[PDB]
Amino acid sequence: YDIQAWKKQCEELLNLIFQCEDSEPFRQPVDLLEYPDYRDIIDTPMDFATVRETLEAGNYESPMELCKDVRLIFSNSKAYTPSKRSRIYSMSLRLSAFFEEHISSVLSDYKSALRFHKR
Numbered sequence: 428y429d430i431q432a433w434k435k436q437c438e439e440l441l442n443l444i445f446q447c448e449d450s451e452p453f454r455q456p457v458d459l460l461e462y463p464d465y466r467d468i469i470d471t472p473m474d475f476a477t478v479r480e481t482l483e484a485g486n487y488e489s490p491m492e493l494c495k496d497v498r499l500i501f502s503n504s505k506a507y508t509p510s511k512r513s514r515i516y517s518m519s520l521r522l523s524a525f526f527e528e529h530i531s532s533v534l535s536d537y538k539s540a541l542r543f544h545k546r
């Protein structure tokens with residue numbers, strides 16, 4: 428029933444994601460010199476360095492807010508890819524499966540802790 432425990436749990440999960448080879452296209456903002464049409468397709472850029480900085484600045488209130496921004500990294504990959512068989516999109520789907528498998532208990536414990544607080 429620790430209402431604050433999600434923050435260290437999310438720091439440790441971001442560390443694992445940075446060690447994963449599948450995260451490399453997603454660690455920093457998409458390079459507009461490499462992809463000059465990117466902002467014609469994607470209205471809200473997101474990347475794992477921006478997620479980690481927002482967490483360490485104390486600018487997330489809950490793990491649900493962090494989860495929304497990580498899911499935006501993956502939806503941006505699906506929208507920008509020219510093929511569902513592309514190398515970079517294929518990496519995004521493995522990373523998404525890994526993320527979803529690990530964040531489920533983080534979300535469950537936080538929501539249980541808050542219900543107990545408000546009982």
Ligand SMILES: CC(=O)Nc1ccc2c(c1)CCCC2=O
Pocket residue numbers: 452457462503504505507508509510513514515516519
């Ligand atoms: C398939 C292909 O040739 N290119 C491709 C696909 C997806 C993505 C990128 C390039 C770069 C930006 C991030 C992203 O998700």
